[PDB]
């Protein structure tokens, strides 16, 4: 009795202490069980998150998921390195909130209007394909549900009803227009491989389009493919610990790479110096030894000046033995460049090829693809490594300093200065004088002439020409005086020349003494340590229109100091977890390459620029981007015209591909008495068949069915939000500006024009998600999917070498299903619904010229447009490959659920190599069992996500030591050097799904990557190139400083140069037009990755919203806010020609005047009032952006500049954007609640 216990009062009094200040009591403490029983749980399950890569402990209590804490049992790193545990971040810690919250999607849902018509149609049409026809072909019916998008009316449906509608619509679209009119968008597969593969596999089997993501998000740094012929390979976070000098340039590490931040904070204790370069005082500055703040968008300038000081002091004045040898062996600096004749001066042309010389330097194979240089004895030579040795021959594609003819050791020379025949003056473009009124400029000359030590040579065709080295061209471009009395070269760092510290100080605002001190310290460290200097770079630089220059500026500094390929040094780019390591095990699964080849990949930026009709509002011209030394008449047309040409030349992919159903081509080729390939080539030449890109609005060349999963596309990722709503969805929109037609602008010369653009192109939008997102809100059908804690899958990252799983702690709640089971069931329904409409069809598929394939050696000297008679139409060389693919539609499900025969028939491979994988398939038959009968009888099964994962683990070299050894052996053929020793000591290694559930496993060194998985050295990008002499997949086989492609030269990007931020002209035409009484002001609009969410995921999570500002907000400097009369947290409106958004202000001192920042994505479903500008619900950050492509990101069929899914293509950069900002007056919620406010 607690009552009776009160009587043992003084009996429970123990000794006093501290001289009567305290009393020790011996009283009951049983009540403490109250908190103990909360902590206790049923079990713990290991899982992670899908779109950091951190393994978590999922706690289940009372049969429900209650919370999570990080797993800390990762394999430990070397004793001299800190370990990874516990990793994690705040977003991840709050995920459990989603499982049973109020915004959980529990049942499949369909727009009421669409359901009403669907059921009435089925009542009049027994066949679902015909029922769908009756609805979609009736303009009034189609529009009734397309306009209901985003306007409420969702009703509960069922898996049976939605699967039939989806299947019917898919069949109808494929049959009447083409498989490529069906598309799917899903991002970053590395976070949940199988979940991504599910939809991609269904789409690939039926012929639909698989949209890209690395370029779409603008996480892809085009400079990487340019310099190294590699999409993105970077050192792991642990490797930062091996660096003794680090610059965090435009990277907010603690906020964007949270679980890895400790390596940066901890390495400081080892003596490493850290420097932060960010316009604002960000979290990253808090952790550095020095904070430099240049004007945003002007970073390339600072890098150029730093490079200037490094070259001057470590390459010229006091030559660094390390640096000198490094650039000699690993760069294209010794390579020779042909000078082109102009009136009064010369211009750098394409690099000299062995084919240009009389006896082709004794080279019969691909002579026009082998660069040339001089050796220490003035003798000319074609060294090993150039991309010409990669195909057609074996044994010479390596970085051994040898003569490509005699196989003898040589020593390339760097500068011709001291052996030149004469001194020619070469012109270099200078853009540092242009720019808007928001950035400081430095007037010089559009063309800066420099004195270059040339050397005349006798060409193989009788003519003669002048040549120089990339090295000489580089020193000149930087403005280094070399005794030739060059007026434009600097005489000191104070001399305001083209690219001096004094010059940079004016443009960036960063003190010249700081630029000099750090450039010096950085280079000195690299020299002492042999390359242990590193630059971590992020979206602060990669999201600008000229991201290529910012990056090349940083890349050069690193190369000049020999930091690339050395542990603790190099280029560390982190923006998106693009690194799915078991690549060649996953690709066949994801794109059904085990059944059919090739698939239909497409680069999303061009795809949406085209189909959401953002080109109809383009304000940027190619003309204003051309070099001042280019023939402006050869580059006429709209930016979209350049894309269309790139497409027909086999440079970029297309989607839809042809203006005619590709399933009907074969049937016409037969009647014409000729095979499909030839019939297509001839029809294209004659114009009877055309690329769909030419007429995107004719009614048959736009996509009609779109699948969206693991994405919030139409709500955060989608640049040009208002355009997508208008043209793709056909719903109300907030666009403010007028299109080309309304302004009387000039129409493109490759694409048809019409005053009234086609609206509501999508017939059916299907979204899979566990929460009702902004995208679901605008969809026709919403499918409840399993959360990351309710399904099995795998995850890998570029931050560490571990492969770990996602696991179902409990079965998917309510009616949710995993992505794999959702698409498997769609496939099953499709397979029966298509009977009688589609059978064993023949498909004609176009495939752009592929990087890492023999065909990458397309057009060696210039650009020829067959469409303009400049050459013959040769598929795979001057146009895309024309492939024939057989599809067994009724067998879609059986193929989806089994590993195809192509793995055994053809084999497997990637990145330019192939191997036999029969043993792996035999193993898989035992692990997954096999089909007892039917079309896939005898083939390994793929019924569960686990089976799919084991397929990935068994086929990939990163997870199967047996395959890893065959992979390296195949590569050894090309290089003539043995590389199998890189995996022989792990040949018995085989990673299993159930084993990674017990403990994350480190992967195996693979030729797919250039870093190594070893116990003595950390993983560092480019390490195999520098240490195994494997060439970078570039024209020269070395790090490319000089881009000699015609377009690169004419657009002024052959060598790096400063390029000021571009003008989007999105503000002046709307500012003031719709006054509300408060002052308006134009500000630079920046959108860095937020702190309370991953893109938009978590943006609706109550925990994240509570720790943030309760919903969408925007940051402004105190000055700008005070100027506009904006107090902290006031409602404000941001807008321009592309649309408008509403948010609450966050006034802060750490935001520099002139700029505003709305952290990337806070989407459109929470706490947003009506807009005073559009009279609609306020928009989001992408309501004020719009896609604007850059020509150089379209180059194809040129060695390192050839296509690859997520490897190259146009990017959606938009930090150059400006918006009008103002305080809101009326705050109307448009919900009929009567709860509106007025700000005064």
């Amino acid at each position: 009795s607690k009552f009776l216990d009160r009587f043992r009062y003084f009996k429970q009094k123990g000794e006093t202490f501290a001289d009567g200040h305290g009393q020790l009591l011996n009283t009951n403490r049983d009540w403490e069980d109250g908190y103990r029983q909360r902590w206790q749980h049923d079990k713990i399950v290991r899982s992670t998150h899908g779109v950091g890569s951190c393994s978590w402990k999922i706690y289940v209590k009372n049969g429900l998921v209650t919370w999570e804490t990080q797993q800390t049992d990762y394999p430990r790193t070397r004793p001299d390195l800190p370990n990874h545990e516990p990793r994690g971040c705040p977003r991840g810690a709050s995920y459990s909130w989603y499982l049973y919250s109020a915004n959980r999607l529990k049942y499949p849902m369909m727009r009421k209007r669409l359901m009403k018509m669907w059921r009435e149609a089925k009542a009049l049409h027994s066949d679902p394909v015909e029922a769908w026809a009756s609805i979609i072909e009736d303009a009034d019916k189609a529009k009734s549900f397309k306009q209901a998008r985003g306007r409420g009316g969702f009703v509960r449906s069922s898996w049976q009803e939605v699967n039939e509608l989806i299947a019917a619509s898919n069949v109808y679209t494929i049959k009447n227009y083409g498989p490529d009119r069906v598309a799917g968008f899903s991002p970053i597969p590395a976070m949940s491989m199988v979940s991504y593969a599910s939809g991609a596999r269904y789409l690939s089997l039926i012929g639909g389009t698989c949209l890209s993501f690395y370029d779409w998000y603008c996480d892809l740094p085009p400079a990487s493919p340019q310099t190294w012929g590699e999409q993105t390979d970077v050192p792991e976070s642990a490797d930062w610990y091996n660096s003794s000098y680090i610059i965090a340039w435009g990277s907010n590490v603690p906020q964007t790479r949270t679980p890895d931040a400790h390596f940066f904070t901890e390495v400081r204790y080892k003596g490493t110096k850290t420097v932060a370069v960010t316009p604002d005082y960000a979290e990253i500055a808090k952790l550095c030894d020095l904070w430099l703040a240049p004007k945003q968008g002007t970073d390339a300038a600072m890098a150029l000046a730093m490079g200037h000081v490094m070259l001057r002091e470590f390459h010229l004045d006091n030559p660094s033995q390390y640096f000198t040898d490094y650039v000699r062996r690993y760069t294209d600096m010794p390579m020779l460049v042909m000078l082109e004749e102009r009136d009064g001066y010369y211009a750098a042309g394409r690099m000299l090829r062995a084919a240009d010389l009389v006896d082709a330097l004794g080279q019969e194979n691909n002579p026009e693809w082998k660069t040339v240089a001089f050796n220490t004895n003035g003798e000319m030579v074609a060294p090993n490594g150039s991309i010409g040795f990669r195909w057609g021959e074996k044994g010479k594609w390596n970085l051994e300093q040898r003569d490509g003819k005699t196989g003898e050791e040589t020593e390339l020379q760097l500068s011709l200065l001291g052996s030149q025949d004469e001194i020619a003056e070469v012109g270099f473009p200078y853009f540092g004088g242009d720019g808007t009124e928001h950035f400081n400029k430095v007037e010089l000359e559009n063309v800066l002439l420099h004195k270059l030590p040339v050397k005349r040579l006798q060409l193989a065709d009788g003519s003669t020409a002048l040549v120089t080295t990339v090295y000489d061209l580089t020193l000149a471009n930087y403005g280094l005086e070399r005794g030739l009395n060059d007026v434009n070269c600097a005489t000191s760092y104070d001399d305001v020349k083209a690219y001096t510290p004094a010059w940079a100080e004016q443009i960036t605002g960063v003190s010249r003494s700081q630029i000099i001190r750090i450039a010096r310290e950085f280079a000195d460290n690299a020299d002492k340590t042999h390359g242990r200097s590193m630059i971590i770079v992020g979206a602060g630089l990669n999201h600008w229109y000229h991201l290529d220059m910012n990056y090349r500026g940083l890349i050069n500094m690193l190369i000049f100091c020999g930091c690339v390929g050395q542990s603790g040094g190099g280029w560390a780019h982190y923006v998106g977890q693009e690194k799915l390591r078991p690549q060649t095990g996953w690709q066949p699964l994801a794109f059904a390459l085990d059944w059919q080849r090739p698939a239909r990949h497409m680069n999303s930026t061009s795809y949406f620029y085209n189909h959401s009709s953002q080109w109809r509002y383009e304000t940027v011209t190619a003309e204003e981007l051309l070099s001042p030394m280019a023939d402006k008449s050869r580059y006429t047309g709209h930016l979209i015209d350049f894309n269309v040409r790139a497409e027909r030349m086999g440079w970029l992919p297309s989607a839809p591909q042809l203006g005619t159903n590709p399933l009907t081509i074969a049937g016409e080729a037969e009647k014409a008495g000729m095979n499909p390939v030839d019939y297509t080539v001839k029809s294209l030449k004659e114009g009877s068949i055309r690329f769909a890109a030419e007429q995107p609005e004719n009614g048959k060349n736009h996509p009609r069915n779109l699948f969206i999963w693991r994405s919030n596309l139409l709500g955060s990722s989608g640049k040009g939000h208002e355009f997508m709503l208008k043209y793709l969805l056909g719903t109300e929109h907030g666009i403010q500006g007028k299109d080309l037609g309304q302004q009387g602008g000039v129409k493109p010369e490759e694409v048809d024009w019409q005053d009234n653009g086609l609206e509501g192109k999508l017939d059916l939008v299907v979204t899979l998600d566990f929460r009702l997102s902004s995208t679901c809100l605008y969809s026709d059908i919403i499918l409840p999917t399993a959360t990351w804690y309710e399904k099995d899958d795998m995850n890998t990252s570029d931050m560490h070498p571990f492969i770990h799983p996602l696991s179902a702690a409990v079965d998917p709640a309510w009616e949710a299903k995993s992505d794999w089971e959702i698409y498997k069931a769609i496939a099953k329904k499709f397979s029966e619904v298509c009977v009688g409409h589609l059978g064993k069809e023949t498909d004609i598929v176009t495939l752009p010229i592929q990087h890492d394939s023999a065909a990458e050696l397309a057009q060696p000297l210039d650009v020829k447009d067959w469409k303009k008679g400049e050459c013959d139409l040769i598929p795979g060389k001057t146009a895309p490959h024309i492939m024939v693919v057989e599809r067994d539609y009724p067998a879609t499900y059986e193929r989806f659920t089994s590993i195809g025969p192509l793995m055994e028939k053809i084999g497997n491979g990637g990145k330019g190599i192939a191997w036999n994988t029969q043993s792996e398939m035999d193993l898989l038959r035992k692990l997954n069992y096999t089909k007892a009968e039917g079309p896939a009888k005898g083939q390994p099964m793929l019924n569960t996500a686990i089976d799919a994962a084991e397929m990935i683990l068994t086929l990939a070299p990163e997870t199967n030591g047996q395959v890893a050894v065959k992979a390296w052996a195949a590569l050894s053929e090309f290089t003539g050097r043995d590389h199998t020793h890189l995996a022989l000591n792990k040949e018995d290694e085989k990673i299993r799904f159930r084993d990674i559930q017990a403990q994350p496993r480190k992967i195996i060194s693979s030729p797919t990557w250039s870093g190594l998985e070893d116990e003595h050295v950390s993983y560092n990008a480019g390490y195999t190139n520098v240490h195994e002499l494997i060439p970078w997949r570039t024209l020269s086989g070395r790090q490319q400083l000089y881009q000699d492609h015609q377009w690169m030269r004419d657009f002024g990007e052959s060598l790096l140069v400063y390029r000021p931020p571009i003008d989007t002209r999105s503000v002046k035409e709307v500012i003031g037009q719709k006054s509300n009484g408060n002052q308006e002001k134009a500000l630079n609009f920046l959108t860095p990755h937020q702190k309370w969410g991953i893109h938009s995921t978590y943006s609706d999570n109550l925990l994240m919203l509570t720790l943030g500002r309760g919903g969408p907000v925007v940051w402004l400097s105190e000055a700008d806010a005070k100027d506009l009369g904006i107090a902290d947290n006031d409602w404000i409106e941001v807008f321009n020609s592309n649309g408008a958004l509403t948010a609450r202000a966050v006034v802060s001192q750490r935001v520099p005047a002139g700029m505003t920042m709305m952290y990337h994505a806070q989407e459109r479903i929470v706490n947003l009032p009506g807009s005073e500008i559009t009279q609609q619900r306020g928009g989001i950050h992408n309501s004020v952006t719009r896609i604007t492509p850059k020509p150089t990101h379209m180059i194809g069929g040129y060695a390192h500049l050839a296509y690859g899914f997520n490897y190259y293509g146009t990017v959606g950069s938009n930090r150059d954007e400006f918006v009008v900002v103002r305080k809101m007056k009326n705050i109307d919620w448009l919900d009929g609640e009567g709860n509106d406010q007025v700000q005064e």
Partner: protein, 219 residues
């Protein structure tokens, strides 16, 4: 009438008394987590300082008066009554004002209303009523300044607490208003163990002599 009289003043007082005691004991042993004052101050501080102090200081004045007046030459019955009418009268005025302010708050202060329980509204309303009734008995006691009325009520009270039957007889002829006050007052003891009034049992007397630091040993 005679039946209702014996019920309310001979029977009822013992029913309410048993429920008050056994109910308190049982809720103490099996409801420790429910034994609190249930402060609402944080949700709405406005007016609470004035209101709560007026009510508690007043209600405590009343309690002291009632306790020593009904359960106890230099202090004859008529002197005791004069004290009750003025001292007790003033206390009841402070109490009633505070009580009314607290009730207004509890009923119309959004955060307090949204989070209150029914028993909280019921118990406070009844105390405001009981306090108002108490004050209304003053003009009646004024008609018998010789303490004739008080003598009856005190006769009843002491008969009840000493378990002497016939307690109702002492009340023969007392003004009706006194009847009401007595019944409502006893009812509050009946509802006592099922409301927030249990906080009263916990008046923190031990604190005045307690050592500052407390440490509990393994147990």
């Amino acid at each position: 009438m005679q039946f209702l009289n014996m019920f309310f003043f001979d029977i009822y007082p013992y029913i309410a008394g048993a429920v008050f005691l056994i109910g308190s004991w049982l809720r103490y042993d099996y409801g420790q987590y429910t034994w609190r004052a249930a402060s609402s101050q944080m949700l709405d501080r406005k007016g609470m300082n004035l209101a709560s102090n007026l009510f508690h200081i007043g209600i405590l004045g009343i309690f002291v008066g009632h306790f020593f007046g009904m359960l106890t030459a230099w202090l004859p019955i008529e002197v005791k009554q004069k004290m009750a009418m003025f001292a007790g009268g003033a206390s009841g005025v402070l109490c009633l004002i505070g009580g009314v302010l607290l009730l207004k708050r509890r009923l119309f202060s959004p955060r307090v209303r949204a989070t209150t329980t029914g028993a909280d509204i019921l118990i406070l309303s009844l105390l405001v009523i009981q306090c108002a009734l108490g004050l209304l008995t003053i003009p009646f006691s004024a008609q018998h300044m010789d303490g004739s009325e008080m003598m009856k009520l005190v006769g009843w009270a002491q008969s009840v607490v000493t378990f002497h039957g016939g307690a109702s007889q002492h009340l023969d002829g007392v003004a009706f208003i006194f009847r009401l006050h007595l019944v409502l007052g006893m009812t509050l003891f009946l509802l006592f163990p099922f409301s927030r009034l249990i906080h009263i049992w916990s008046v923190p007397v031990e604190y005045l002599t307690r050592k500052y630091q407390l440490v509990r040993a393994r147990h």
